[PDB]
A paper describes a structure:
A prominent therapeutic target for antileishmanial drug development is leishmanial GDP-mannose pyrophosphorylase (GDP-MP or GMPP, EC 2.7.7.13), an enzyme catalyzing the formation of GDP-mannose by condensation of mannose-1-phosphate (Man-1-P) and GTP. As GDP-mannose serves as a central precursor for biosynthesis of diverse glycoconjugates necessary for host–parasite recognition and is essential for parasite survival, disruption of Leishmania GDP-MP activity leads to complete loss of virulence, suggesting this enzyme as an attractive target for development of new drugs against leishmaniasis. LdGDP-MP exhibits a hexameric structure with a molecular weight of ~245.3 kDa, consistent with previous observations.
We next solved the structure of LdGDP-MP in the absence of any cofactor or substrate at the resolution of 3.4 Å using single-particle cryo-EM imaging technique, which comprises of six subunits and exhibits a D3 symmetry with a dimension of ~104 Å × ~104 Å × ~108 Å. The homoheximeric LdGDP-MP complex is organized as a dimer of trimers, with each subunit pinched by two neighboring subunits via two interacting regions, namely, interface-1 and interface-2. In interface-1, the two subunits are attached in a shape-complementary manner between the region around the canonical signature motif GGXGXR(L)XPLX5PK of pyrophosphorylases (PPases)8 in one protomer and the C-terminus of another protomer; whereas interface-2 formation is mediated exclusively by the two C-terminal domains crossed at ~70 degrees. The contact surfaces for interface-1 and interface-2 amount to ~590 Å2 and ~750 Å2, respectively; and the interactions are established predominantly by hydrophobic interactions together with a few hydrogen bonds. Strikingly, replacement of R23 with alanine (R23A) caused loss of ~77% activity, whereas the mutations of P364N365 to arginines (PN), deletion of the last three residues on the C-terminus (ΔIIM), their combination (PN&ΔIIM), or deletion of the entire C-terminal domain (C-del) rendered the enzyme completely inactive, indicating the essential role of interprotomer communication in attaining leishmanial GDP-MP activity. On the other hand, disruption of the interface-1 contacts led to instability of the quaternary organization, as evidenced by drastic changes in the oligomerization status.
Numbering used by the authors:
A (entry chain B), B (entry chain D): 191 to 196, 201 to 250, 256 to 379
The structure:
């Protein structure tokens, strides 16, 4: 600690000038989670590193509310209900009290907090809001982030579109964009 | 029968000229099934007229292979297997030996002869081939006709595209067109 009014970061050039700066090589993964794409990539790199950390034949989480199959490792919150014939894809996370329909596909996607999901939808490489209420037969794929308390009708196809909070969606979007 | 070498609509002007032509007014439906769109419209007008004709609380066909729900009247071939949680939409037809997945949406669509359908797909206002083999989580909607012995991979979205026989589809199509 030295009083340096505005500042070469932490005075690193001088730190090397007196030659007391050391480096520690890391064998593990490293990436900056600053974007939704980087968010998904960090999740898919970080999930396998938690095998010895937390509680969760692929037995990361297999029988919660019914006989469903998980292709790869995933984080299933114990209070959640998965359904009867869902297929939780590789490297997926699900929050507390989340409800997943009778048959679903959660592929490399994150479901946060209290969310309801219908029957037959596919959530691929995407994120959903906190109190999100998702339709039954929709199709959400690519890097699309859904804000808080959004709702989508049945049979909508959001492909890489970010929606703002409290909005409502009822129409297809086949191109990247933003919904206000 | 009179020998008229070539043509005037079987000589209807003269037929009326001798004044021996009668007409019968029809109270029922009538339309020319010459296009897939007209095919779908004729099906949706003709299905309700068969309530007293053939064998098939909405009890047109309710329990075949599992406890599934039918929203409206539909024609389910007895040899078919519907699944466990399918939702056969209004005015749909299914051919013999057809297999429908655990949860499906057959909405105003026709399935012809031996076809297999995965889990969670949606077939809306469309037709499928004879020996068609449909993927699991696909999404086929709008007026799209699939030829004979076509196959679609998982998670494809065909929106109003007509595919030729024996072809294979593995990529999305968000616009009307033809696949060779």
């Amino acid at each position: 600690l030295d009083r340096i009014p505005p500042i070469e970061k932490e005075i690193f050039p001088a730190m090397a000038a007196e030659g007391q700066l050391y480096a520690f090589n890391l064998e593990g993964f490293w990436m900056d989670v600053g974007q939704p794409k980087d968010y998904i990539l960090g999740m898919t790199k970080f999930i396998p590193s938690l095998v010895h950390g937390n509680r969760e034949t692929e037995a990361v989480e297999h029988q919660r509310g019914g006989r469903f199959t998980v292709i790869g490792a995933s984080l299933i919150d114990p209070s959640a209900k998965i359904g009867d014939g869902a297929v939780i894809g590789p490297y997926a996370s699900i929050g507390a009290n989340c409800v997943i329909g009778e048959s679903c596909r959660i592929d490399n996607a994150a479901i946060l907090e209290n969310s309801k999901v219908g029957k037959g939808t596919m959530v691929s490489r995407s994120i959903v809001g906190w109190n999100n209420r998702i339709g039954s037969w929709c199709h959400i794929k690519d890097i699309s982030v859904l804000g808080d308390d959004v709702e989508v009708k049945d049979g909508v196809i959001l492909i890489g579109t970010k929606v703002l909070p409290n909005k409502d969606v009822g129409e297809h979007r086949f191109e990247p964009g933003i919904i206000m």
